[PDB]
Amino acid sequence: PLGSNEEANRFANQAKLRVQEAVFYIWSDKTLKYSQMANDEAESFRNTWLLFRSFQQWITLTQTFKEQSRLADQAFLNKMFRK
């Protein structure tokens, strides 16, 4: 109704926008968050693995000493066993 075909240029500024947001979002919204997101998943990994290593070292030793201990008494009888 009103206005010219400078509006063709009011349509470029707008097309350049649908693309600005497009690339701005894949940059930020998508891509840059993974810098925080996986940065956390990284800590959580480190952490979990750190725990696991120490805990597995702890518990298996306990298991061995129990298991050894109950073999020491076993052993101690084996002398008196043969009367």
Partner: protein, 146 residues
């Protein structure tokens, strides 16, 4: 090889608007703007090359059927990188060949966004791969490529 629905629509959407007189044809005048909307800036005489080529009378008008094909094949021969390269320039308003803090500061507000300078600093600091605190073209291409 085949146009996306977004692409197909674009063509139609453009040829629809710059057809001032609804009449179904675009004259030279109408075409020049049509192609500049779709992103193309051809030499004025090359636009006339087109009209005349696809024009079986001394009429000087282009049918939609012909626009679609001409534009269509002009869209596919599009270099993927040209789009990316022409994307950089919209951020680099100053045209320094490097994307700045204040550059993005201008984008974010223009895209209706509230983000601290740490949020923005974070965005650059991550992709700045030489240490100058700013994104040159290669790095920007990278951001985009997969």
């Amino acid at each position: 090889s085949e146009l996306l629905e977004e692409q197909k629509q674009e063509i139609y959407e453009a040829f629809s608007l710059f057809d001032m007189n609804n009449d179904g044809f675009l004259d030279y005048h109408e075409l020049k703007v049509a192609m500049k909307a779709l992103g193309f800036e051809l030499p004025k005489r090359e636009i006339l090359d087109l009209i005349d080529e696809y024009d079986s009378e001394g009429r000087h008008l282009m049918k939609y059927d012909d626009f679609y094909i001409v534009m269509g094949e002009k869209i596919l021969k599009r270099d993927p990188l040209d789009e990316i390269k022409r994307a950089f320039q919209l951020f680099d308003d100053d045209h320094t060949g490097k994307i700045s803090i204040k550059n993005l500061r201008r984008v974010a507000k223009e895209l209706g966004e509230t983000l601290t300078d740490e949020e923005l600093r974070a965005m650059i600091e991550e992709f700045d791969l030489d240490g100058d605190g700013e994104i040159n073209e290669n790095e920007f291409i990278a951001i985009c490529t997969d």
